[PDB]
Amino acid sequence: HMATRDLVLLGEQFREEYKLTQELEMLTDRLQLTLRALEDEKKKTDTLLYSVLPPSVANELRH
Amino acid sequence: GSHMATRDLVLLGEQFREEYKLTQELEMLTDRLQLTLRALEDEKKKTDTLLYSVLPPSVANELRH
């Protein structure tokens, strides 16, 4: 017993779930970009931390 | 000797706070992810109910086991 109402409404349910997965994709895309921004910031911080050291000590830490 | 001048110290302080700003954005985004997942769970149970509801009760009961 699937009337026209139930069929239309099932169609609308699928569409609502797609809007939500589209939001999940946008969020995860942004999360990956913000992680990359953190990686880039960290590279700068790390450089600054090495820069204040005596070179033989810096050398020793780099491995 | 080491050479951490006042400039280097101040800048390192600025590096740390720039990084906290980024981790705060990461926490916000992850919060929104979990909120969006919860809305999807809520929507999925409505869809699920609709799909059971159109079946003969016996069939739905049988699938529910």
Residue numbers in the entry:
A (entry chain B): 346 to 408
B (entry chain A): 344 to 408
Q: What does the article say, verbatim?
A:
The soluble guanylyl cyclase (sGC) is a heterodimeric enzyme that, upon activation by nitric oxide, stimulates the production of the second messenger cGMP. Each sGC subunit harbor four domains three of which are used for heterodimerization: H-NOXA/H-NOBA domain, coiled-coil domain (CC), and catalytic guanylyl cyclase domain. The CC domain has previously been postulated to be part of a larger CC family termed the signaling helix (S-helix) family. Dimerization within sGC is mediated by at least three inter-domain interactions involving the GC, H-NOXA/H-NOBA, and CC subdomains.
We determined the crystal structure of the Rattus norvegicus sGC CC domain (residues A348-K409) to 2.15 Å resolution using SeMet single-anomalous-dispersion (SAD)-phasing. Crystals were initially obtained of the wt sequence but the SAD phasing required the introduction of an additional Met residue via the I371 M mutation. The I371 M mutation that was generated for SeMet phasing is not involved in the dimer or tetramer interface. The turn is initiated by a conserved proline residue, P399. Four sGC CC monomers come close together to form an apparent four-helix bundle in an anti-parallel arrangement with two of such tetramers in the asymmetric unit. The side-chain directions of a-helices follow a heptad (a-g) repeat in that residue i and i+7 face the same direction. The CC dimer interface is formed predominantly via the a-d pattern residues and the a-d assignment, as obtained from SOCKET, is indicated in Figure 1B.
